[PDB]
């Protein structure tokens, strides 16, 4: 996260770190949506251009974390993966369209003050909150500039008008994406960066005061560049796929 700040303890209890077994390293961000399911970006697990194609046994899920590098004894819980599910129409060849994947855990994780699932939006929540100007929140242990942070970083960013998102890049933007971030003329800044991929873009509903994950950190050209914005997978648009996988394999 670029230009964000340290997260408060228990501020993002659904935050998940995707951890590579060997070499031991941070692979991506992710989120807890139930005691057995974790949501992330498909490119965190499959991206042929960079010869990335992880299988279940290559990684681990660390939940309830705050510190990036430390083993948080008595706080974080480490889970193994039972199965990975990538959207069948995830477009890694062109523009990361449908950048979403699910991971089922071998055993249920116990909730605590530091571990708690985030909600997934229904049609009305998405229609009501996914509006230009409305701010969401992005969290991650990714790079601070285009070294690494000591603890989870957080930044609030405004959703941007679709025409503006499109005119900021040469990449083909789809309805399964939305972008967020400040304009150069707005002064404030902030953006997700390398390592933040797969992390959640959340919003707190003013209707029922619950947090909903509206997006997944997907891509950006550089980090926090003026005139550029961060792009996120539109979670509601792909919820039918999410429900299908969980109904069938859950």
């Amino acid at each position: 996260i670029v230009e964000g700040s340290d997260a408060e303890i228990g501020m993002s209890p659904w935050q998940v770190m995707l951890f590579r077994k060997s070499p031991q390293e941070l692979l991506c961000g992710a989120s807890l949506i139930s005691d057995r399911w974790v949501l992330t970006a498909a490119h965190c697990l499959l991206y042929p251009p960079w010869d990335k194609n992880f299988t279940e046994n290559d990684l681990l899920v660390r939940i309830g974390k705050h510190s990036r590098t430390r083993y948080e004894r008595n706080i974080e819980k480490i889970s193994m993966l039972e199965k990975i599910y990538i959207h069948p129409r995830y477009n890694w060849r062109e523009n990361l369209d449908r950048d979403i994947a699910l991971m089922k855990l071998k055993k249920p994780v116990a909730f605590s003050d530091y571990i708690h699932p985030v909600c997934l939006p229904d049609r009305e929540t998405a229609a009501s909150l996914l509006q230009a100007g409305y701010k969401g929140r992005v969290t991650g242990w990714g790079n601070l500039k285009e070294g690494q942070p000591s603890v989870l970083q957080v930044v609030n960013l405004p959703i941007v008008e679709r025409p503006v998102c499109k005119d900021s890049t040469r990449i083909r933007i789809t309805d399964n994406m939305f972008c967020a971030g400040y304009k150069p003329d707005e002064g404030k800044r902030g953006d997700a960066c390398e390592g933040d991929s797969g992390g959640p873009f959340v919003m707190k509903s003013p209707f029922n005061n619950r947090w909903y994950q509206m997006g997944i950190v997907s891509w950006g050209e550089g980090c926090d560049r003026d005139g550029k914005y961060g792009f996120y997978t539109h979670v509601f648009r792909l919820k039918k796929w999410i429900q299908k996988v969980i109904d069938q394999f859950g």
Partner: peptide, 9 residues
């Protein structure tokens, strides 16, 4: 860079 994690995982 990362502190080792218990071998059990």
């Amino acid at each position: 860079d990362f502190e080792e994690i218990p071998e059990e995982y």
